[PDB]
Each structure stands twice: as C-alpha cells, then as structure tokens.
C-alpha cells in the first residue's frame, strides 16, 4: 500500500 514514512516522502 501507500506509506508516508516518518511524515515525509510519499510512496503511494
């Protein structure tokens, strides 16, 4: 799924 890591980049 998507992931905004430590409230940083986005890997959606």
């Amino acid at each position: 799924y998507c992931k905004e890591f430590x409230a940083t980049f986005k890997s959606c």
Side-chain angles (χ1 to χ4, degrees):
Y1 13 76
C2 314
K3 47 170 110 162
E4 324 199 178
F5 315 74
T8 181
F9 170 70
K10 297 263 221 229
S11 233
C12 199

